[PDB]
Amino acid sequence: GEALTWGVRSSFNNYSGGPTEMLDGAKQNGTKNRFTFQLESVTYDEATEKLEAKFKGGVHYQKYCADEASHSDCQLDLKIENPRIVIAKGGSHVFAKVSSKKYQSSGTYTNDGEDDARPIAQLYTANATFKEEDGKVTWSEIPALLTKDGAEMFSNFYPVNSGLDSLTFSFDKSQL
Numbered sequence: 477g478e479a480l481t482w483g484v485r486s487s488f489n490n491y492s493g494g495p496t497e498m499l500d501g502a503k504q505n506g507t508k509n510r511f512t513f514q515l516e517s518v519t520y521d522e523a524t525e526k527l528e529a530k531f532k533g534g535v536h537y538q539k540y541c542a543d544e545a546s547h548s549d550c551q552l553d554l555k556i557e558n559p560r561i562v563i564a565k566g567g568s569h570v571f572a573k574v575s576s577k578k579y580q581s582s583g584t585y586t587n588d589g590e591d592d593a594r595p596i597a598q599l600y601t602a603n604a605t606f607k608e609e610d611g612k613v614t615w616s617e618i619p620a621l622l623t624k625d626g627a628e629m630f631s632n633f634y635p636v637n638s639g640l641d642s643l644t645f646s647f648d649k650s651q652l
């Protein structure tokens with residue numbers, strides 16, 4: 477409860493062997509493919525029908541390290557932190573603070589996670605499960621697709637609109 481559960485992308489966790497480290501209190505399951513980010517805050521504006529939930533914690537993936545024992549000088553170095561979900565009438569998305577080294581380049585893809593023009597995923601709540609009981613709200617198995625920014629974070633290894641892991645989050649009605 478009071479958390480976001482999301483694995484980002486199943487095949488990416490398999491390719492990378494999962495995050496080299498969990499950041500800022502985020503947790504991971506035993507198989508390193510499902511992450512849990514604690515709820516920082518949640519607001520719902522009735523008139524605009526906009527729900528916004530901010531979570532804490534991050535994942536750091538590293539691969540192709542020149543010093544493999546200490547994970548230093550890694551050609552693949554991806555951080556995804558403080559996920560924020562916006563579920564609204566005009567569109568639903570996942571935003572996050574990202575830093576990702578680009579494939580065959582010195583360029584680093586960055587995203588501060590506070591720019592509404594640069595979401596990393598688009599969310600489709602039409603067929604997701606929604607439950608509210610005993611003051612607890614859970615919105616489960618919400619499908620997610622990669623946006624243009626999300627594709628850039630993965631060095632365009634995936635096309636735009638390719639699938640991501642579905643997400644689940646929960647909060648108490650008292651926190652609204």
Ligand code: HEM
Pocket residue numbers: 487488491540551552553554576577578579580629630631633634
């Ligand atoms: C610079 C050296 C790199 C080499 C030699 C390399 C090699 C490969 C190979 C052989 C695959 C195919 C296996 C698979 O799809 O699981 C792959 C997949 C992938 N690579 Fe890397 N890669 C490099 C860097 C990067 C970087 C910098 C990124 C950026 C995030 C990246 C992201 C990906 C992604 C997203 C996939 C798809 C994995 C999946 O979902 O299965 N790669 N890479």
